[PDB]
């Protein structure tokens, strides 16, 4: 019943889906990577800690690479042209029940739902106006 | 124009939480729900050129604690009743529109129901 | 594999308290119940080689105060609502499996119903 | 109606049971020992004190010896090859009623019940995974 | 999850040596066989980013010689001696899954029965 | 004689990588695959008396990535990068042939298909 399982990070409709699988749990940080070389792989990391006496903090990081082939010293190597970084920090009081956490999760899901302002602004290289 | 209201929490039509625009000072968009500022859902979004090669999106979400809450009452301490989400998205300036759509899809798939991270968050648990 | 859920408090089938796995960071197993983290039963267990000749088990149990409690509410101060058990078991490296079973039986018989220590704890009393 | 009585520490099913009996109450520490020499005897100690203004702390210690015969200077002596130590510290708020203490006791009993993860891990010289 | 129990020495069903996870402190996974710790097989594995382009694996295995020590009439389960294996594998970050599979295949074929190195080790001899 | 040709990478008849003896200078045996030396697999083995009671084996394997370099219009067969394996096995002089066979069996079972370490190496990942 472990939750350290693989999941589809980018859903392209069956074909072309990006899937990340568990790869590391050292130092209390769970890590997911895609089935590529580590210089061209998507990376997802999650960790939870007791920040204050009455607060718990989640730290989630996502790395989205742009794959490319670079010629270094006459030899072609698989590299990433650039990487997009997502940094998420969620602080939840210790008094929050399971229903409150479900509310937080639903709010996070609805924040980035297709058609909403913020995802549309991100996908259009524009701000909110 | 995209500064409109949207359903932040979807409950199947009944009980939906809708956040409407409430502030645009300094170019930062803000959405709040029909509640007091101590018990409301707040979403803020802004984008800026962080470095010479990167653009950074700053998204902040505030979620109230609903269980055993008093609507319109004074609930103290504040830190014991509010959940804070601070999301930062760094995109290099070379990314096209399709790359941004791919990043958006990755973010959506990260928090899709049934995936490890949302299940861990929703169960007051970590990764095991 | 032994990282599974188990009945922490047995009430004869009805009202049983079950703790399920919730964290495995740094190799430390953690169990919590279906409650908020301020009102839940928490069990953590870890084993390490403390010295050159001994292995040490560290077991920590947290029990909430149930009498006159508000389910899902903010109860302060924290120290007035939680009971903390910190158990440390030191086993020399020369102990076989049978020796470990004997130690487990000794620990079980120490807290068996009717024995002095559990009766003293359950009656808010000492040894008289 | 005193609770300073003897009890079976290790229940081997009638035959071979290890029984500890009261032996000392000096300096506020109740002590149980088995009917052996003090170099080969099981020892159980319990004490309660008012740690803070609103907290009470129980201190329970159990010693499990491994009996052996050692030849020192040509003479055989009853000693213990090694000793296993259990240290328990239980902090209970002063606002906890008898029902809350019964809940704590039941949780402690169910933590070490046969078949549960922690006792199985201890009895198998392994951790939790 | 790969932090599970596995057979270290395969003796054909009966007499197999099995190691179970025991500790994951400081990012170093550890496997220990059952029974007395003094006469137990130990396997440790850890992976780190050595350089900007390389990832290094560190694997250690200890094989004990089971014996009984008698000093002054006291019998203790100990190990007469231990054999220590230290493996260090460096893999560049440009290696794909196929490259890692090929490296694993090479490592397996290095110690396959009938090959020079395992035959030399099993015969208490070198290369001749 | 064990200083013979053997298959390093078994690809099922076709595509097998074979290494042949090339040098035995200073007590270090060396195996090199055919064709260009720049894109050749290298295996070296040497055994020495490290201490008064221990014998140490030193085994090194290099796996190249075959590539073609073009500088100024001149094409040369080179290796884009190489993976280096360093193994050091210490065996006490008290070990018999059975003990050495058991050590070899342990080494083979460490890298057997399906086991944690080879699966991690072949998947470009660590222990999770």
Contact A128, B2 (CB under 8 A): yes
Method: cryo-EM
Cβ-nearest to A37 among E1, E47, E93: E93
Q: A5 contacts in F (CB within 8 Å)?
A: none
Helix/strand/coil (H, E, C) string of chain C? CCCCCEEEECCCCCCCEEEEEEECHHHCEEEECCCCCCCCCEEEEEEECCCCCEEEEEEEEEEECCCCCCCCCCCCCHHHCEEEEEEEEEEECCCCHHHHHHHHHHHHHHCCCCCHHHHHHHCCCCCC
Cβ–Cβ of A2/C23 closer than 8 Å? no
Cβ–Cβ of D96/C114 closer than 8 Å? no
Q: Write down the residue that tokens 């990391």 correspond to.
A: A45
- Model resolution, angstroms: 2.4
**Residue B56 CB-density burial (10 A; 0-12 exposed, 13-18 middle, 19+ buried):** middle
| C-alpha to C-alpha distance for C88 and D89, rounded to whole angstroms | 9
Cβ–Cβ of E8/F106 closer than 8 Å? yes
**Residue C5 CB-density burial (10 A; 0-12 exposed, 13-18 middle, 19+ buried):** middle
With b meaning 16 or more CB within 10 Å and e meaning fewer, what string describes B60-69? bbbbbbbbeb
Do chains C and D meet with 3 or more Cβ pairs nearer than 8 Å?
Answer: yes
Q: What domains does chain D contain, in order, with CATH numbers?
A: 1-129 (3.30.380.10)
DSSP string covering A47-109, please?
EEEEEETTEEEEEEEEEEEEEEEEEETTEEEEEEEEEEEEEEEEEEETT--HHHHHHHHHHHH
Q: Which chains touch A (3 or more CB pairs under 8 A)?
A: B, C, E, F
| C-alpha to C-alpha distance for C92 and E108, rounded to whole angstroms | 37
The tokens describing D95, both together, are: 């606002």
Cβ-nearest to C94 among E4, E25, E36: E36
Per DSSP, the three-state class of A35 is coil
Which residue from F minimizes the CA distance to E100? F122
Q: B45 contacts in A (CB within 8 Å)?
A: 117-118, 121, 127-128
- Pairs of CB atoms within 8 A across B/C: 35
Cβ–Cβ of A54/C78 closer than 8 Å? yes
The tokens describing E45, both together, are: 């594995």
């Amino acid at each position: 019943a472990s939750n350290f399982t693989q999941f589809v990070l980018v859903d392209n409709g069956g074909t072309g889906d990006v899937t990340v699988a568990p790869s590391n749990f050292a130092n209390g940080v769970a890590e997911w990577i895609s089935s590529n070389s580590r210089s061209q792989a998507y990376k997802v990391t999650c960790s939870v800690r007791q920040s204050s006496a009455q607060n718990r903090k989640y730290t989630i990081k996502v790395e989205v690479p742009k794959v490319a082939t670079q010629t270094v010293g006459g030899v072609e190597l698989p590299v990433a042209a650039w990487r997009s970084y997502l940094n998420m920090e969620l602080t939840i009081p210790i008094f929050a029940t399971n229903s409150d956490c479900e509310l937080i999760v639903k709010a996070m899901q609805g924040l980035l739902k297709d058609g909403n302002p913020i995802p549309s602004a991100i996908a259009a290289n524009s701000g909110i106006y």
